[PDB]
Design a protein around this motif. Structure first.
Motif, PDB file in Angstrom:
ATOM      1  N   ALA A 148       6.314  -5.893   8.043  1.00  0.00           N
ATOM      2  CA  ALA A 148       6.050  -6.685   6.842  1.00  0.00           C
ATOM      3  C   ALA A 148       5.446  -5.773   5.779  1.00  0.00           C
ATOM      4  CB  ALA A 148       5.134  -7.869   7.154  1.00  0.00           C
ATOM      5  N   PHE A 149       5.205  -6.337   4.594  1.00  0.00           N
ATOM      6  CA  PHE A 149       4.799  -5.545   3.433  1.00  0.00           C
ATOM      7  C   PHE A 149       4.343  -6.474   2.308  1.00  0.00           C
ATOM      8  CE2 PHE A 149       8.575  -6.490   0.971  1.00  0.00           C
ATOM      9  CZ  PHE A 149       9.462  -6.864   1.961  1.00  0.00           C
ATOM     10  N   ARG A 150       3.915  -5.863   1.200  1.00  0.00           N
ATOM     11  CA  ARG A 150       3.463  -6.562   0.003  1.00  0.00           C
ATOM     12  C   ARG A 150       3.952  -5.805  -1.228  1.00  0.00           C
ATOM     13  NH1 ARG A 150      -2.555  -7.436  -1.691  1.00  0.00           N
ATOM     14  NH2 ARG A 150      -2.826  -5.651  -0.277  1.00  0.00           N
ATOM     15  N   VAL A 151       4.222  -6.535  -2.316  1.00  0.00           N
ATOM     16  CA  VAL A 151       4.835  -5.944  -3.502  1.00  0.00           C
ATOM     17  C   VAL A 151       3.945  -6.108  -4.730  1.00  0.00           C
ATOM     18  CG1 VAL A 151       7.179  -6.311  -2.635  1.00  0.00           C
ATOM     19  CG2 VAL A 151       6.123  -8.034  -4.135  1.00  0.00           C
ATOM     20  N   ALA A 152       4.219  -5.273  -5.734  1.00  0.00           N
ATOM     21  CA  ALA A 152       3.629  -5.393  -7.066  1.00  0.00           C
ATOM     22  C   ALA A 152       4.699  -5.006  -8.079  1.00  0.00           C
ATOM     23  CB  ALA A 152       2.386  -4.516  -7.215  1.00  0.00           C
ATOM     24  N   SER A 158       8.564  -0.423 -22.986  1.00  0.00           N
ATOM     25  CA  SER A 158       7.887   0.565 -23.816  1.00  0.00           C
ATOM     26  C   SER A 158       6.788   1.284 -23.037  1.00  0.00           C
ATOM     27  CB  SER A 158       7.294  -0.102 -25.063  1.00  0.00           C
ATOM     28  OG  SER A 158       6.300  -1.053 -24.717  1.00  0.00           O
ATOM     29  N   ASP A 159       6.139   0.566 -22.118  1.00  0.00           N
ATOM     30  CA  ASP A 159       5.072   1.111 -21.285  1.00  0.00           C
ATOM     31  C   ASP A 159       5.309   0.769 -19.820  1.00  0.00           C
ATOM     32  OD1 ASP A 159       2.718   2.501 -20.760  1.00  0.00           O
ATOM     33  OD2 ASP A 159       1.641   1.539 -22.413  1.00  0.00           O
ATOM     34  N   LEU A 160       4.340   1.076 -18.963  1.00  0.00           N
ATOM     35  CA  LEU A 160       4.427   0.723 -17.556  1.00  0.00           C
ATOM     36  C   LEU A 160       3.078   0.180 -17.112  1.00  0.00           C
ATOM     37  CD1 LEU A 160       4.261   3.766 -15.133  1.00  0.00           C
ATOM     38  CD2 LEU A 160       3.457   3.855 -17.489  1.00  0.00           C
ATOM     39  N   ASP A 161       3.115  -0.773 -16.184  1.00  0.00           N
ATOM     40  CA  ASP A 161       1.900  -1.350 -15.625  1.00  0.00           C
ATOM     41  C   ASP A 161       2.244  -2.033 -14.312  1.00  0.00           C
ATOM     42  OD1 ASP A 161       3.469  -3.181 -16.910  1.00  0.00           O
ATOM     43  OD2 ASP A 161       1.825  -4.338 -17.783  1.00  0.00           O
ATOM     44  N   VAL A 162       1.242  -2.179 -13.455  1.00  0.00           N
ATOM     45  CA  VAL A 162       1.429  -2.844 -12.171  1.00  0.00           C
ATOM     46  C   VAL A 162       1.044  -4.310 -12.311  1.00  0.00           C
ATOM     47  CG1 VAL A 162       1.203  -0.772 -10.768  1.00  0.00           C
ATOM     48  CG2 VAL A 162      -0.837  -2.041 -11.441  1.00  0.00           C
ATOM     49  N   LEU A 163       1.664  -5.148 -11.482  1.00  0.00           N
ATOM     50  CA  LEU A 163       1.527  -6.601 -11.552  1.00  0.00           C
ATOM     51  C   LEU A 163       1.119  -7.152 -10.185  1.00  0.00           C
ATOM     52  CD1 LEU A 163       2.043  -8.846 -13.825  1.00  0.00           C
ATOM     53  CD2 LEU A 163       2.591  -6.499 -14.451  1.00  0.00           C
ATOM     54  N   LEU A 164      -0.015  -6.665  -9.671  1.00  0.00           N
ATOM     55  CA  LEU A 164      -0.601  -7.220  -8.454  1.00  0.00           C
ATOM     56  C   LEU A 164      -0.692  -8.744  -8.492  1.00  0.00           C
ATOM     57  CD1 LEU A 164      -3.453  -4.605  -8.076  1.00  0.00           C
ATOM     58  CD2 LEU A 164      -1.361  -4.738  -6.720  1.00  0.00           C
ATOM     59  N   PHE A 165      -0.670  -9.337  -9.682  1.00  0.00           N
ATOM     60  CA  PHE A 165      -0.554 -10.776  -9.868  1.00  0.00           C
ATOM     61  C   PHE A 165       0.893 -11.095 -10.225  1.00  0.00           C
ATOM     62  CE2 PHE A 165      -0.871 -10.750 -14.649  1.00  0.00           C
ATOM     63  CZ  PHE A 165      -1.187  -9.411 -14.795  1.00  0.00           C
ATOM     64  N   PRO A 166       1.741 -11.401  -9.241  1.00  0.00           N
ATOM     65  CA  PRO A 166       3.169 -11.558  -9.546  1.00  0.00           C
ATOM     66  C   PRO A 166       3.457 -12.820 -10.337  1.00  0.00           C
ATOM     67  CG  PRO A 166       2.758 -11.201  -7.174  1.00  0.00           C
ATOM     68  CD  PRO A 166       1.454 -11.551  -7.807  1.00  0.00           C
ATOM     69  N   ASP A 167       3.623 -12.654 -11.647  1.00  0.00           N
ATOM     70  CA  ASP A 167       4.020 -13.749 -12.515  1.00  0.00           C
ATOM     71  C   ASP A 167       5.530 -13.939 -12.420  1.00  0.00           C
ATOM     72  OD1 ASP A 167       4.490 -15.574 -14.564  1.00  0.00           O
ATOM     73  OD2 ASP A 167       3.000 -14.675 -15.901  1.00  0.00           O
ATOM     74  N   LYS A 168       5.967 -15.189 -12.255  1.00  0.00           N
ATOM     75  CA  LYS A 168       7.400 -15.449 -12.165  1.00  0.00           C
ATOM     76  C   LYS A 168       8.094 -15.226 -13.502  1.00  0.00           C
ATOM     77  CE  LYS A 168      11.105 -15.910 -10.252  1.00  0.00           C
ATOM     78  NZ  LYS A 168      11.776 -17.013  -9.516  1.00  0.00           N
ATOM     79  N   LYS A 169       7.433 -15.589 -14.602  1.00  0.00           N
ATOM     80  CA  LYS A 169       8.050 -15.475 -15.919  1.00  0.00           C
ATOM     81  C   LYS A 169       8.423 -14.031 -16.236  1.00  0.00           C
ATOM     82  CE  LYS A 169       5.206 -15.302 -19.168  1.00  0.00           C
ATOM     83  NZ  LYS A 169       4.010 -15.818 -19.892  1.00  0.00           N
ATOM     84  N   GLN A 170       7.431 -13.140 -16.259  1.00  0.00           N
ATOM     85  CA  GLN A 170       7.672 -11.765 -16.679  1.00  0.00           C
ATOM     86  C   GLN A 170       8.713 -11.098 -15.787  1.00  0.00           C
ATOM     87  OE1 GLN A 170       6.558 -12.066 -19.790  1.00  0.00           O
ATOM     88  NE2 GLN A 170       6.029  -9.886 -19.684  1.00  0.00           N
TER      89      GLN A 170
END
Length: 371
Positions: A148-152, A158-170
């Motif tokens: 098993a595993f976990r994603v971000a 234009s930029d990059l960032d991590v999404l430890l809070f997985p928003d469905k919209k974005q």
């Protein structure tokens, strides 16, 4: 094979701790190590998360430096003769690494293909492996096998960032419950007794053959997944082309009005297991596609809301299917992940079988419509 069940009992007792998405296949269980970007197809129906597919590449080659460590520990012992291990990475090295290295703007080899297809891209942030080579009734499961595993998710425009809070919209690039399941499935199904029945029957038989062969399913999936190019898709051999010949005209052009329901069920079938494919082909050839249908429907009705452990009541033998270890409905439920017994309560309901079960219901409701 057996590799599926074990991962179930792993997450079964873990109660989906931190959305530990389980692995599906063994040939793709070796690719799920830390810092392994995965791709996820465009969002299907709201009731199942499509499987996370791997692209077999890392992220150190994706920024300007081509270079950290996994903050190991977290011994999670066994879960009952099989000890498990895990690897993690603290957020402190995530922010520091993001600040130390900047997006490798000259990168369009997969990036252009992804932004063209419009997929989502996620990064593996935690892995579940073994510090043992376990072999039990035989198979040869090696040391270091990922269960098993976990994603971000990250986004790149234009930029990059991590999404430890997985928003469905974005996305990487730029409604109800069981009653809604009824409505959505019905609305999709009513748009299928639209073409002339002879073609419908030909499609059903093509599908029956396709179910018995995973490779045919995959090939049909690739021909039309997220490409849907202006050009007519080239037919493939076997029952997959027997399906594609049913979905086009003499010129070979495809019609999205008929395509959308097909990809929908394809997702419904990709969520399901191989044995479930075989059982559906048998239920189609034997026309026993309604018994398990009403059963799963009434079970999902009594299991609302989902994601909450509640034992169910309804007996299947009273409804009409044959019971006993080995019956199609029994094995079907066990493949979905529900624990069955011989006497009462004949059922335990678990939240982890949420997605697949809805797809099982969906597949059944669609097949009965053409029969």
């Amino acid at each position: 094979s057996a590799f599926e069940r074990v991962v179930r009992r792993v997450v079964q007792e873990l109660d989906h701790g931190g959305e530990f998405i389980p692995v599906t296949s063994l040939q793709s269980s070796t690719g799920f190590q830390p810092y392994c970007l995965v791709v996820r197809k465009p969002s299907s129906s709201w009731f199942w998360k499509p499987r996370y597919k791997c692209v077999n590449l890392s992220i150190k080659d994706i920024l300007e430096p081509d270079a950290y460590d996994a903050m190991d520990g977290q011994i999670q012992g066994s879960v009952e003769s099989m000890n498990v291990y895990s690897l993690s990475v603290d957020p402190n090295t995530w922010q520091t690494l993001l600040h130390e290295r900047h997006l490798r703007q000259p990168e369009h080899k997969v990036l252009q293909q992804l932004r063209s297809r419009g997929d989502n891209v996620y990064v593996v942030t935690e892995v579940l492996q073994t510090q043992k080579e376990v072999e039990v009734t035989t198979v040869t499961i090696p040391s270091g096998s990922t269960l098993a595993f976990r994603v971000a998710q990250l986004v790149i425009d234009s930029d990059l960032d991590v999404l430890l809070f997985p928003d469905k919209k974005q996305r990487t690039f730029q409604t109800e419950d069981f009653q809604g399941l009824r409505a959505e499935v019905e609305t999709i199904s009513k748009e299928l007794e639209l073409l002339d029945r002879e073609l419908c029957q030909l499609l059903l038989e093509g599908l029956e053959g396709v179910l018995r062969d995973q490779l045919a399913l995959r090939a049909l999936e690739e021909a039309l997944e997220q490409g849907q190019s202006l050009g007519p898709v080239e037919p493939l051999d076997g029952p997959a082309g027997a399906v594609l010949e049913c979905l086009v005209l003499s010129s070979g052009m495809l019609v999205p009005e008929l395509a959308i329901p097909v990809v929908y069920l394809l997702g419904a079938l990709t969520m399901l297991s191989e044995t479930q494919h075989k059982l559906l082909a048998e239920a189609l050839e034997s026309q026993t596609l309604l018994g398990p249908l009403e059963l799963v429907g009434s079970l999902l009705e009594q299991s609302a809301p989902w994601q909450e452990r509640s034992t169910m009541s309804l007996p299947p033998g009273l409804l009409g299917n044959s019971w006993g270890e080995g019956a199609p409905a029994w094995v079907l439920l066990d493949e979905c992940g529900l624990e069955l017994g011989e006497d009462t309560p004949h059922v335990c309901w678990e939240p982890q079988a949420q997605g697949r079960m809805c797809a099982l219901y969906a597949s059944l409701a669609l097949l009965s419509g053409l029969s």
